[PDB]
Design a protein around this ligand. Structure first.
Ligand code: ATP
Ligand code: ADP
Ligand code: C0G
Ligand code: C0G
Lengths: 266, 265
């Protein structure tokens, strides 16, 4: 068997290949000791590593392992998954929405990193904690789907009132920009959490359409685990990608692009 | 006298000219008292811009020309840059207000090249949610000597002891260190420093991205979001220089739109 590991800041993504059967395992980066141990109990024909914690694994296992640069590995894996699922895209932006967010332009034969921003899943978790005292990711994300942003976010029509805006009125003018018009309010943990995800999705999508235009593609492929159990984030990103005339794509097992890629760079 | 007013989401910026200009600011909140002041005054020419120009116009008892904010801001900025001894053949400008709007100026005119709702309004609102402080002077002041280190995550923190493929001192995930420091103490300074951080960083990233697209090294930052907030100016200044671009701040750049309303007329 063959194993691929993308050991990120938050999640360790593991892909095992026997015959042609794939196994897709996720594990916490916090529990990296139990990944190293599992690995040490296994019969492995080939081990390929990538991600920020790849080296922690590599220095505590009993076998050699090839190590790849995660930008390369993610592009390779995502090419594999896009093909298999029927997407045949000449070019595209891809946005790896992980703990942080990295943005890449794939021109048809290779990738180039073209931007990055620190708004991603880490912010959802961290800023989510500070506003809700919720540490559990499922709990945090589920609760945010129950939320309404309208008392928190300020729209363009709120600013332009009864006059004609220079950009459409329903757009977000200012994330958290309505909070001070609603100080009579509670600000419920759900509402606050939807606004966090709101701001994270809008920033990511904004940067992505921006570089899409810069590199003259209209296809944007979103990946990373930040979308798992977060319909809200996936909605926010999708709607605004379409609103600005780009085509968004999500891919089955998108979050393992890295782990897959590492296997097929060997 | 001639009057130019940029009535924003949060602040109303007033410029009076006799001969010689006067700069004055008031809260959008208190728009009523701006209208009262316009109504008692003899004015040769009143020019309006911004989202609340309409609210002004329909409550004043005199006529008023209304100009579009992006054109006016561009025009006033050009004027202010020149008066302050700059000759930039082109530039990005980043109007950082309640929300942020980004423009490319090619030497003759401006195009909007994007925008983002991370801006002064988010500082105020998210900073209220993290701290319960509503007074702006106070909010921005608490932030100034905060420490972001237990809150933000650097690339070096993800990459541990191996060589990262981008510089390790870079922020990797805003608020991304929070869960590794659950052992109390998120203080209001550190939290507010982190809000400013994320807003400075998002704004600048957008700015330098459009600066590359449009092939200019010059980025001019305006808006009242920089008032009483050295840390926002620092965060933005440093990341811009990091990315190869030249940052510029402009004395009274918050009044760009007000000034421009007067000289499009
Ligand atoms: N079970 C989970 N526990 C914690 N976070 C989760 C979970 N499932 C999804 N997430 C989300 O996924 C995000 C991380 O996604 P991902 O696996 O792409 O990042 P990473 O590769 O660990 O980080 P990076 O590659 O930026 O170092 C988390 O911050 C969180 O928002
Ligand atoms: N005295 C103040 N009161 C409230 N907000 C202020 C003040 N001074 C600066 N600000 C900041 O500036 C922002 C407004 O920027 P501005 O350029 O005036 O935008 P707008 O045109 O939308 O009013 C506020 O969101 C706040 O962050
Ligand atoms: C694992 C990665 C680090 C590749 C991933 O999480 C990522 O790309 N994160 C975002 C990193 C980034 O590009 N940040 C942008 C940034 C923007 C502004 C900054 C800054 C950093 O440092 C200080 O000012
Ligand atoms: C006064 C203005 C509205 C001109 C100024 O505050 C501004 O330009 N704000 C930002 C508007 C913007 O470009 N927003 C970006 C945005 C990004 C994502 C969005 C979205 C809007 O609506 C829903 O998803």
């Amino acid at each position: 068997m063959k194993v691929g590991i993308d050991a990120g800041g938050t999640l360790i993504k593991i892909v095992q290949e026997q015959d042609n059967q794939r196994t897709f395992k996720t594990e916490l980066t916090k529990n990296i000791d139990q990944v190293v141990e599992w690995l040490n109990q296994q019969q492995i024909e080939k081990l390929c590593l990538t991600g920020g914690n790849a080296g922690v694994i590599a220095e505590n296992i009993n076998i050699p392992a090839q190590i790849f640069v995660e930008f390369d590995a993610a592009s390779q894996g995502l090419g594999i998954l896009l093909k298999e699922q029927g997407h045949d895209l000449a070019d595209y932006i891809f946005a790896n929405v992980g703990t942080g967010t990295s943005l890449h332009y794939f021109d048809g034969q290779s990738q180039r990193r073209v931007g990055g921003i620190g708004t991603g899943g880490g912010m959802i978790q961290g800023l989510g904690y500070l506003l809700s005292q919720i540490t559990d990711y499922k709990q945090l994300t589920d609760m945010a789907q129950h939320g309404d942003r309208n008392t928190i976010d300020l729209k363009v029509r709120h600013i332009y009132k009864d006059t004609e805006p220079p950009i459409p009125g329903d757009l977000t003018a200012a994330n958290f920009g309505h909070v001070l018009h609603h100080l009579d309010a509670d600000f419920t943990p759900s509402n606050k959490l939807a606004a966090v995800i709101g701001v994270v999705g809008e920033v990511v999508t904004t940067m992505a359409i921006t570089v899409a235009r810069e590199f003259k593609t209209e296809n944007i492929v979103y990946i990373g685990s930040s979308f798992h159990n977060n319909a809200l984030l996936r909605k926010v990103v999708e709607d605004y990608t379409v609103l600005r005339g780009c085509k968004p794509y999500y891919v089955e097992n998108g979050a393992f692009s890295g782990a897959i890629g590492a296997l097929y760079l060997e």
